[PDB]
Design a protein around this ligand. Structure first.
Ligand SMILES: CCCCCCCCCCCCCCCCCC(=O)OC[C@H](COP(=O)(O)OCCN)OC(=O)CCCCCCCCCCCCCCCCC
Ligand SMILES: CCCCCCCCCCCCCCCCCC(=O)OC[C@H](COP(=O)(O)OCCN)OC(=O)CCCCCCCCCCCCCCCCC
Ligand SMILES: CCCCCCCCCCCCCCCCCC(=O)OC[C@H](COP(=O)(O)OCCN)OC(=O)CCCCCCCCCCCCCCCCC
Ligand SMILES: CCCCCCCCCCCCCCCCCC(=O)OC[C@H](COP(=O)(O)OCCN)OC(=O)CCCCCCCCCCCCCCCCC
Ligand SMILES: CCCCCCCCCCCCCCCCCC(=O)OC[C@H](COP(=O)(O)OCCN)OC(=O)CCCCCCCCCCCCCCCCC
Ligand SMILES: CCCCCCCCCCCCCCCCCC(=O)OC[C@H](COP(=O)(O)OCCN)OC(=O)CCCCCCCCCCCCCCCCC
Lengths: 459, 172, 120, 39, 63, 54, 94, 221, 64, 99, 52
């Protein structure tokens, strides 16, 4: 997998060497094709994993993501052509390159055989992200948000560093292939009960768990649209990908060491879903929607039943695409409105007829409408959770009712009701804004036709 | 050649004759005549012309046959090479043993649409099988996590082979 | 560590014994990296000194890409030796003191009984 | 609307001989820029 | 909100129809293959195990 | 529970714990006598650390 | 553009502060009744009558028509709840 | 000004309604169950500007989603225990417990069919255009709850407990809704209450385990 | 703007930990989180026992 | 007060360039930055990509397993063997602990 | 070909280099070339490599 990567690196030379006026089209047009080369990995004609080479591999779980990581770079660069079009021609070429490095790094992290290669690349992605959030962040508080995003991930990260070096000494190689075909069975000691927490905690932090998710609402609030898309679509899912590949070892402990997180997540799912119900900042509501719909995932990567896992793989890819779509349209309202407040800007369909159709489809993806991969995902996690304990439906049942309420409230108070009297007149929709959306949903429609590709390792 | 009758048994068809008890015309008969003349003949003509074009240039495709490698039961410990070739041989049969169960899921479904109001009885050739096959799938692949591996089926079995040996010894 | 080894060359860079090892292919990814590492140093310099970034010091750019690379071949040539000594040393000991590193025997998975923890 | 660049007040805090000023520590004053004192 | 669709409904329909012409004409004239027995030592090539012709064109030429 | 209790406990507390710890460790007279005496204490403790673990 | 002076602050302790805040919030100094000081965050935000926008005169030309709220009038803490959609505190014949 | 969009959603409603009608596996039944719910939301609040229409639309989604929790519970129970969402196999669960699941479908029916629990959104649904009120509020959308139980009644006959449960609640909704209708002074709202009262009678026949006649009333209703 | 600042950025600067706030700030975070644990542990334990003793039917369940 | 610029206004790019596509202010760059984005975006990724992804053959072997089952079910049923025997790794291979 | 037609060849070239670098890895990991058990066959006539 060096075509999904080397051609990517070369994007950096192109963003720099290219003309200031033509820099945007060379980069966006080329990475669209970079995504097309990424699609070749999907050609798996047998169940064996495609080990491209010693360090680089792609199995069913990584492949559905590498393609998404390559896909969003085009979109990210199309959603940030407006803001970042007021810059000095060298601030742009920095932002474009920053976005380019994220998927170079993220493509490799999702396509990495050695778990510590994951760690080095895993924690590197913070550098590009923190720059995108802090350097271009509009609000006074991004310095703070950046600190929260760096420390919560970093304090979790050093325990994983110690744990992975620890298993290398215990087993003798951090190669995901071998670690899988070798006998690593923890022994339920008090210490192992700590190892397990060391490995999972760093992944559980960037996958916002109810206890440590305050970093994500603060980060996406002041982050520029491209950073918020990256955090929701690819960055948070880095934590999920890690939990799937790391729990191959630590096989016995999670049977009983998971209860704490599972309950934290399911109760967390309800409270995070509910506070979405009365949050005035739209970007705030989407972020907590992201916490709740990701709290379902940590509760399926821990129950560990075949269906959970691919419920997880289905939902992660699906929610990634949906969340960005929501964060992308939130930005289009923010740029014309100039405020994140949900109460202002009422009645837009009256003035932006189509964006409202995109808003409606994004919300229906947000809630579980049935001919969507989003629902298949939740339906499956719901099933397994029920298997874990029939009572789980109650808590995963209060979340579904709340999820319907906030998803439609975003449509009802932003895209319906009487028009706002006279905010700065709202200029019509650009074709870029609409495509950036179409590019998010057309793939959501196509993937829903053949869900098999994003089903995970389990199935 | 679309489906092998012996893998998807279809009970023979018995149809009551068309016995009319009224001089009133039976609309469907007339409609069906039309459907054939307007909807079938036209289509029928096209289809054939398809298959003849297909015949002019005909190709074949085979079904990879996988030689059987040594199973984990016999495979050195720590030898990642042998075990890798043997966890695949199982993960492969984890699927071949799963579409089999897909067929019994299906063969039955049909046998309860084809025998309504009698499903309680006529369709018990299958449901006896749906337990003869489910009691087995449950005994070789169920407790396992999402990290299903041949080593774990080897243990799921061998935890119970004690029981078919402790219980037996116990009965004494 | 590896110092104090018999025959150690007290201040030498790479003892001739390292002649036995294969020479680093000039295009070894690493030496090529050092090259790029170098080009960047050059470009960076131009930048910090406020010169046209790429179109200036085309002589320097060469000194850089060619100094770093030169350094590489002769460094890697050594680091490669050091690692090679490590095996000579390591493998030898495994034998000279065989009992301490016995070849234990691994049973087939049939014999071994690994406890099955159901997921349920 | 432009990214908020830091104003004078945000800058002020970083002055003073200690970032997080203590009870008695705050009483101190920043070192002379020339590295030479008036005494 | 209408200039967009004439452009989106167009450049999909631009490359979309030549595809649809391609899937239909191939599926019509060339056709999926019929399954057969490996003939005592044919050792069939990778492309030989797939049904649809263009789905084994990609396999023969690129994988 | 969001905002105050989950921000005062984990994110903010760790902020304060350190802030306070730096305030005591870095509030130094700057006088040499004080500092030096601390060297005295150290020599004493290390002398002991060796002594008791002889 | 809005100085902190014009944004919410701490519980008005002295009476001059209770009259300074009432200016910030465009209220009458004798109507500013700070939310009770129990340290739950309300701060100086006025404790406006808990009445929903439903019974705000439905004929008057409210600047913000749908929130039935004028421009400048102190917004209620829970206006996300007593809005014309979500909750209805309105008198009932029974 | 937007007649064409209105006709467009009405047929999309019909497509979801018929999919809900003819659905073998229940995953497709869900696609229909949720699908009519969303387009009802789009069509009750046709005139989005009016907040009253928006309030009713959010009402309808909330009541339907409480019902959705029941269908998900039944789906999950049939995704475990007997294993396939296809009706042709679910019906092999006749001699099992089938209470955890059918109680779920009864919950789904009560929300969709406006039984005494969460009965109010169908009166609220009249905030929609009158034609929308006729085809979806009057016939296809509400009967969906009655239709689901008739589909699953081979299982319903086995459990006596749930049969009287819906006989009882169907009965309470019949009079509760009818008594409310006597004094209502809005013509559309009297007819809507009558829609609920007749379905209450339907619910009663399903509760007395008489599925075929219940379907007969659905068509005549 | 005075409303949003009062509601998401003027809260923690006006937080003083009292009683009726920390007792009520622990019953809300750990109360149900401990409730459901004894709801899920007891169920999961009931299930496991029954499976171990051989009573749970797990019929036609070929999935999980 | 200190020196600094006054907040700049945001231009109505739709006032000039009434055909603004949202990519860049000068018109030709805009046209050529959508003529290449709709094309490389939709015309040869959503179309050529979906074509290729649709034609990936027997993805993860699930087209192979519905036949291998059919010949195994064909072979097992006709020869009278159990369709899915109840132990997979043969009991003979397994040397159970003798205790 | 350098009137801005050379910046367009940068990425296309990266693909080529990648493909080359990639096929190189195949050359390195060629042990068990055909020595695997499931896929071990006698080199058919006129074939010196089962997979290249
Ligand atoms: C890949 C990993 C994840 C990557 C994410 C980002 C990728 C972006 C770049 C690549 C985008 C395209 C490639 C990825 C998606 C591929 C989808 C696809 O290939 O569709 C296959 C489909 C043919 O179906 P087939 O594959 O044969 O199904 C198996 C049946 N046994 O081919 C078709 O028939 C296409 C048909 C198009 C029209 C579909 C019309 C029906 C739509 C139903 C919508 C239902 C409601 C959806 C609601 C959503 C929420 C509102
Ligand atoms: C916050 C994010 C999560 C942090 C989790 C920290 C867990 C402890 C450090 C992580 C490394 C780890 O747990 O490795 C296992 C190690 C014992 O491993 P092992 O060599 O098997 O020893 C057992 C007895 N022989 O167990 C240990 O490392 C114990 C380390 C104890 C000190 C940890 C730091 C305490 C800070 C106060
Ligand atoms: C389990 C999850 C654990 C999560 C831990 C999160 C730790 C970081 C939370 C946020 C800390 C923080 O924001 O520190 C800021 C504080 C004040 O300084 P600052 O904000 O830079 O300046 C004032 C404004 N101009 O600066 C400080 O008071 C010290 C900041 C310490 C940063 C974290 C250090 C962790 C060390 C672990 C050992
Ligand atoms: C006698 C007792 C019999 C047994 C109990 C039967 C009833 C059980 C509870 C069912 C739900 C009851 C409340 C449902 C909410 C609702 O009805 O919304 C109505 C509200 C206002 O609408 P309305 O007043 O009808 O129309 C305006 C007329 N001027 O419209 C609104 O928009 C209100 C706000 C809706 C969104 C927030 C509501 C809370 C959402 C999360 C919690 C959902 C309920 C709790 C979880 C499910 C519990 C089953
Ligand atoms: C039966 C219910 C048992 C509940 C047990 C847990 C709650 C214990 C409550 C102790 C109350 C102590 C108290 O007097 O009030 C708050 C306490 C002192 O308050 P005060 O003297 O005003 O000074 C505060 C700092 N300026 O100020 C503090 O102690 C601050 C730390 C509070 C720690 C207790 C509450 C923790 C809540 C964790 C929530 C996690 C989510
Ligand atoms: C919203 C609809 C709710 C519908 C509830 C339906 C309940 C069905 C009957 C359940 C009880 C009998 C079950 C019989 C078969 C299962 C037997 C079993 O294993 O369950 C054990 C469980 C034990 O729970 P508990 O009573 O707390 O025991 C703790 C002992 N130290 O037994 C129990 O869990 C008893 C309690 C069951 C109901 C739990 C609460 C459900 C609703 C919770 C809403 C959210 C509550 C949040 C509370 C926060 C508190 C701070």
């Amino acid at each position: 997998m060096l075509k999904i990567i080397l051609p990517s690196l070369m994007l950096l030379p192109l963003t720099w060497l290219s003309s200031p006026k033509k820099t945007w089209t060379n980069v966006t047009s080329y990475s669209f094709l970079i995504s097309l080369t990424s699609l070749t990995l999907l050609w798996q004609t047998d169940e064996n994993y495609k080990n491209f080479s010693n360090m680089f591999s792609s199995d069913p779980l990584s492949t559905p993501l590498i393609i998404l990581t390559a896909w969003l770079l085009p979109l990210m660069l199309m959603a940030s052509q407006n803001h970042l079009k007021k810059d000095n021609n060298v601030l742009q070429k920095l932002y474009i390159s920053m976005l380019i490095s994220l998927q170079i790094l993220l493509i490799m992290t999702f396509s990495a055989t050695e778990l510590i290669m994951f760690y080095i690349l895993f924690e590197a992605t913070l550098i590009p992200t923190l720059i995108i959030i802090t350097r271009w962040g509009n609000q006074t508080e991004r310095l703070n948000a950046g600190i929260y995003f760096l420390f919560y991930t970093l304090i979790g990260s050093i325990p994983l560093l110690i744990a992975l070096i620890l298993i290398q000494n215990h087993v003798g190689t951090l190669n995901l292939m071998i670690l899988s075909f070798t006998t690593h069975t923890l022994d339920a000691s008090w210490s192992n009960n700590l190892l397990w927490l060391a490995c999972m905690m760093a992944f559980l932090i960037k996958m916002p768990l109810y206890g440590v998710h305050l970093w994500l609402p603060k980060a996406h609030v002041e982050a520029p649209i491209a950073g918020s898309m990256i955090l929701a679509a690819i960055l948070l899912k880095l934590g999920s990908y890690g939990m799937i590949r790391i729990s191959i070892i630590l096989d016995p402990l999670t049977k009983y060491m998971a209860y704490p997180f599972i309950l934290l997540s399911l109760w967390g799912m309800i409270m995070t879903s509910s506070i979405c119900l009365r949050q005035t900042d739209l970007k705030s509501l989407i972020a907590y929607s992201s916490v709740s719909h990701m709290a379902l995932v940590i509760a399926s990567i821990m129950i560990q039943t075949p269906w959970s896992f691919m419920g997880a793989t289905m939902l992660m890819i699906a929610h990634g695409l949906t969340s960005s779509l929501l964060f992308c349209l939130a930005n289009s309202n923010y740029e014309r409105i100039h405020s994140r407040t949900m109460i202002m800007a009422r009645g837009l369909q009256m003035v932006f007829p189509l964006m409202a159709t995109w808003w409606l489809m994004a919300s229906l993806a947000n809630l579980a409408l049935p001919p969507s991969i989003n629902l298949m995902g939740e339906l499956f996690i719901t099933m397994s959770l029920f298997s874990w304990s029939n009572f789980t439906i109650i808590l995963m049942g209060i979340n579904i009712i709340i999820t319907g309420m906030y998803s439609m409230y975003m449509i009802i108070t932003t895209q319906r009701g009487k028009l706002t009297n006279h905010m700065i007149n709202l200029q019509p929709s650009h074709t870029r804004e609409l495509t950036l959306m179409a590019l998010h949903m057309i793939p959501l429609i196509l993937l829903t036709t053949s869900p098999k590709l994003i089903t995970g390792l389990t199935m | 050649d679309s489906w092998d009758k012996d893998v998807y048994p279809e009970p023979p068809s018995r149809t009551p004759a068309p016995s009319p008890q009224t001089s009133l015309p039976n609309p469907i008969t007339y409609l069906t005549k039309a459907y054939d003349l307007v909807v079938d003949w036209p289509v029928t003509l096209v289809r054939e012309f398809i298959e003849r074009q297909h015949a002019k240039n005909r190709t074949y495709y085979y079904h990879r046959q996988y030689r059987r490698v040594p199973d984990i039961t016999e495979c050195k410990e720590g030898d990642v090479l042998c075990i890798y070739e043997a966890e695949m041989q199982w993960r492969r049969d984890f699927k071949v043993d799963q579409e089999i169960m897909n067929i019994i899921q299906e063969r039955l479904k049909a046998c309860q649409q084809r025998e309504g109001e009698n499903y309680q009885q006529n369709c018990a050739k299958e449901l006896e099988q749906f337990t003869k096959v489910t009691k087995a799938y449950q005994d070789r692949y169920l407790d396992l996590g999402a990290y299903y591996s041949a080593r774990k089926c080897l243990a799921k079995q061998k935890q119970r082979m004690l029981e078919e040996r402790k219980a037996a010894r116990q009965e004494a | 560590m590896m110092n104090g080894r018999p025959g150690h060359e007290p201040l030498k860079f790479l003892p001739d014994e390292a002649r036995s090892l294969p020479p680093p292919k000039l295009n070894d990814p690493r030496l090529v990296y050092m090259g790029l590492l170098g080009y960047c140093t050059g470009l960076m310099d131009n930048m910090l000194r406020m010169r046209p970034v790429m179109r200036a010091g085309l002589h320097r750019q060469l000194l850089f890409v060619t100094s770093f690379v030169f350094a590489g071949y002769f460094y890697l040539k050594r680091q490669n030796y050091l690692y090679a000594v490590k095996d000579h040393d390591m493998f030898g000991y495994i034998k000279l003191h065989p009992e301490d590193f016995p070849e234990k025997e691994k049973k087939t998975y049939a014999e071994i009984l690994e406890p099955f923890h159901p997921v349920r | 609307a432009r990214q908020w660049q830091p104003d004078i007040e945000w800058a002020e805090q970083f002055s003073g001989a200690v970032m997080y000023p203590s009870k008695e520590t705050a009483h101190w004053k920043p070192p002379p820029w020339n590295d030479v004192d008036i005494l | 909100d209408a200039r967009f669709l004439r452009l989106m409904k167009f450049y999909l329909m631009l490359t979309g129809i030549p595809v649809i012409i391609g899937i239909t004409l191939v599926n019509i004239f060339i056709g999926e293959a019929e399954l057969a027995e490996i003939p005592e030592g044919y050792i069939p090539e990778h492309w030989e195990y797939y049904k649809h012709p263009i789905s084994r064109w990609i396999a023969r030429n690129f994988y | 529970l969001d905002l105050i209790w989950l921000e005062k406990t984990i994110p903010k507390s760790t902020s304060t714990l350190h802030t306070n710890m730096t305030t005591l460790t870095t509030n130094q007279k700057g006088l040499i006598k004080l500092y030096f005496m601390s060297f005295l204490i150290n020599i004493i403790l290390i002398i002991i650390l060796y002594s008791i673990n002889l | 553009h809005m100085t902190k002076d014009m944004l919410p602050g701490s519980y008005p302790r002295t009476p001059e502060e209770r009259a300074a805040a009432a200016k910030k919030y465009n209220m009458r100094v004798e109507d500013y009744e700070p939310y009770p000081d129990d340290g739950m965050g309300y701060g100086d935000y006025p404790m406006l009558p808990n009445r929903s926008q439903h019974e705000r005169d439905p004929w008057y030309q409210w600047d913000h028509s749908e929130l039935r709220m004028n421009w400048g009038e102190p917004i209620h803490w829970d206006l996300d709840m007593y809005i014309r959609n979500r909750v209805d505190t309105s008198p009932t014949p029974v | 000004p937007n007649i064409n969009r209105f006709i467009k959603y009405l047929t999309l409603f019909l497509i979801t309604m018929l999919i809900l009608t003819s659905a073998n596996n229940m995953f497709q039944l869900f696609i229909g169950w949720e699908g009519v719910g969303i387009m009802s939301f789009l069509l009750i609040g046709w005139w989005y500007g009016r907040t009253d229409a928006n309030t009713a639309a959010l009402q309808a989604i909330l009541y339907n989603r409480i019902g959705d929790i029941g269908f998900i519970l039944a789906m999950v129970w049939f995704s475990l225990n007997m294993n396939s969402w296809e009706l042709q196999q679910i019906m092999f669960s006749n001699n099992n417990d089938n209470l955890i699941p059918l109680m779920g479908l009864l919950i789904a029916a009560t929300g969709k069919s406006a039984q005494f629990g969460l009965h109010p959104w169908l009166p609220s649904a009249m905030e929609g255009p009158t034609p929308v009120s006729a085809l979806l509020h009057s016939s296809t959308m509400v009967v969906a709850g009655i239709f689901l139980l008739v589909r699953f009644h081979p299982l319903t006959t086995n459990n006596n407990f749930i049969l009287t449960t819906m006989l009882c609640l169907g009965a309470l909704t019949t009079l509760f809704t009818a008594i409310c209708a006597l004094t209502q002074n809005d013509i559309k709202k009297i007819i809507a209450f009558s829609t609920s009262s007749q379905l209450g009678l339907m619910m009663v026949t399903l509760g007395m385990n008489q599925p075929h006649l219940a379907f007969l009333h659905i068509c005549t209703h | 703007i005075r409303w949003t600042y009062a509601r998401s950025a003027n809260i923690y600067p006006n937080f003083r930990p009292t009683p009726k706030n920390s007792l009520l700030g622990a019953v809300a975070g750990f109360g149900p989180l401990i409730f459901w644990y004894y709801v899920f542990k007891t169920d999961r334990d009931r299930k496991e026992r029954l499976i171990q003793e051989g009573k749970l039917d797990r019929k036609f369940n070929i999935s999980y | 007060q200190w020196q600094e610029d006054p907040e700049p206004e945001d231009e109505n790019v739709y006032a000039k360039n009434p055909d603004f596509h949202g990519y860049d202010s000068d018109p030709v760059v805009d046209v050529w930055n959508m003529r290449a984005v709709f094309f490389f975006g939709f015309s040869i990724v959503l179309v050529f990509g979906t074509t290729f992804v649709a034609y990936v053959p027997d993805y993860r072997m699930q087209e192979w397993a519905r036949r291998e089952a059919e010949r195994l079910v064909k072979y097992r049923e006709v020869n009278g063997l159990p369709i899915m025997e109840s132990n997979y790794f043969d009991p003979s291979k397994i040397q159970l602990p003798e205790d | 070909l350098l009137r801005e037609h050379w910046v367009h060849i940068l990425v296309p070239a990266g693909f080529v280099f990648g493909c080359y670098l990639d096929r190189k890895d195949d050359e390195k990991l060629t042990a068990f070339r055909n020595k695997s058990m499931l896929f071990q066959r006698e080199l058919r006539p006129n074939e010196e490599v089962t997979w290249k």
